[PDB]
Subunit: 273 residues, 3 copies
């Protein structure tokens, strides 16, 4: 059995995706998740939805409790986490509305706990050094890429996400520098969400949707809250269809080996006294 946690991002966190919905507030050792978990199904597949920023978008990226969110989904029995994330495009060919199935990140966050193993929690004892060479589940990403193609969606098969602390958007000097580093898209939430998922032995994949060109390009609409909201109003249906079509595919394929390998990588990264 698979069970899929879905973490909804900005404008991309609609509960109406699940049938047979039940709201469940939970607690974890790291505190409360962003909001109630929503338990439901897509076709025959058990899913668990969680709004990254709360259902009213009340929590800014720096204050999102990534530890509690991931812990809650794990405790619920999730084998996979597929998230949505809005993002700025750092590449001419990645147009607003395009989906990017990201495969790498560059961390520019500064204020966030990136591990469960902080020496303060009984549930996560020891020192943990998780490998990050392959941060995203390649098997899940494959299915997302193939599905987006079946849907006729404009979609990119890879991309490096730079995650900034926020909540401010980047300056132009920063935007230009991220391009020189080889970042393709920019957001405020991928790190440490992807890190904690890996420590939890969970298959994690991200659906990034471009909403703007940040501030590097010429003759584009400037990034702003209104601009991001506008692009998502117009294009959010794409991410919904992709999830709805991808999820039944995940449920019909075999994961025992992939998950065994993840659980091992996670277990062997922890040193006990």
């Amino acid at each position: 059995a698979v069970k899929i946690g879905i973490i909804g991002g900005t404008g991309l966190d609609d509960p109406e995706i699940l049938e047979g919905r039940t709201e469940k507030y939970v607690d974890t050792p790291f505190g409360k998740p962003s909001d109630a978990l929503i338990l439901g199904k897509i076709k025959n597949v058990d899913c668990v939805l969680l709004a990254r920023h709360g259902r009213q978008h009340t929590i800014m990226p720096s204050k999102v409790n990534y530890q509690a969110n991931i812990w809650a989904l794990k405790e619920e029995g999730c084998t996979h986490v597929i998230v949505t994330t809005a993002c700025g495009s750092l590449r001419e060919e990645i147009q607003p509305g395009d989906i990017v199935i990201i495969d790498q990140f560059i961390d520019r966050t500064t204020m966030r706990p990136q591990s469960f193993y902080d020496g303060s929690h009984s549930c996560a004892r020891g020192v943990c050094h998780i490998p990050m060479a392959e941060p995203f589940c390649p098997k899940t990403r494959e299915v997302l890429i193939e599905t987006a193609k079946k849907l006729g969606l404009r979609c990119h098969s890879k991309g490096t996400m730079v995650t900034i602390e926020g909540p401010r958007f980047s300056s132009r000097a920063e935007s230009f520098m991220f391009r020189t580093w080889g970042a393709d898209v920019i957001n405020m939430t991928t790190v440490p969400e992807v890190v904690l998922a890996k420590e939890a032995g969970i298959c994690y994949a991200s659906i990034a949707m471009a909403t703007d060109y940040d501030c590097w390009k010429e003759h584009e609409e400037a990034v702003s809250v209104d601009r991001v909201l506008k692009t998502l109003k117009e294009n959010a249906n794409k991410a919904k269809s992709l999830l709805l079509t991808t999820i039944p595919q995940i449920g019909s394929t075999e994961w025992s080996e992939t998950l065994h390998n993840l659980k091992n990588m996670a277990q062997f990264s922890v040193l006990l006294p």
Copy 2:
């Protein structure tokens, strides 16, 4: 009516610039500002001076309460904030003693709140994502650039400031890397001062004065506290004259549109529940 807050930096924070001086200690929801506000005038113009590091230079860059400083100046009724900042030069042609009217930044700070909207304050409710494509007021910068020319001062019409956490100065590897990124000057205070000013709807501009060549160049005096202090002893009069000459120019030009546009950009960056 305009009112100009002036935040004095290292060696560049002299109260004697204002006539008709009155000392006023204030409180804000984010805590106490660095020091007493000093209320005064330059020609007919209402100004408010604040020493970034305290009048005895007792507060290091990491511990400066940028939120309280900006909030205090806003509450006082400031329409503009013009600051001074000492800095290292990352460019051969920017010589110690030169003024740089910076137009961009690269953030390398790690420990600083960069927003009023942290979900803990009643006075600043919601989630705020301020755009940072144009961090400094171009109209104020124009007047500074034209004025420095009228004064015959060595001055650069643009520049990218990298702001490091400090309080240590950079290593040589870091100094060299900042050059590859396209940083022109280096300090410890521009971020998040410039960010918070933007969230407050205030026209912010910075007078940067080069005091050293950091540690990248050859055959220059090494950066140290003594070296920075020495260059400022010799050149601080320039920043004083530039302020004294610029400020009456700001007071005689029309700002209603510029300020309306800033207030809008600020208001539309905030999402309420």
Copy 3:
């Protein structure tokens, strides 16, 4: 008289290096050091050993009390600090098992106090801006380099260490970017250990041992805890021999000038009210 603090890193923190061992737990104004200081001698030389991560490796890099560690060694009367550090290699020619006598760093840490002078401690009053152009003692490094040659060890005479926050290892995008920056090796502990040593007026040098190629190369064993542990099991004897041979050399050379210059650089970096 010299006295040498030795901070042992991962797999490189063996007390058996000292003769005449006495265990001494201490307190400092910044809290407790990682573990008991171990007082002892190498030939005629007074040494003080401290396990960076605790003797059971229980403390992850982010939580190591670098302030307490350096303060404790200073209070004990150490003139020099020579440390060991495991690291990933960012350079083809730096092979697992090679020693790198690092001479520069690039800071990518985010959560660590980098100064004793935080305005909260009576023992360290004022604002301190330590110069970091030459972070490591060149005289100590010379002796390490010459000694490693006498031992026939594969050793590199310089290198730039990028220190990441951890505890996760880097992504591939990050690993590749650190190469473009000119980093040669990667770890999680050099900063701010090297910074605090400089503020304390102590000669600091680092013995870095490559344990892996991080994740940038092709056809190498992936970095993981097991992989790092394996390389250290095989090569730790090298770092031990190098320390044991270097230390008597330090004790027989003259340091009064070097140490006077360090003490001055440290004293003149502090501004009092």
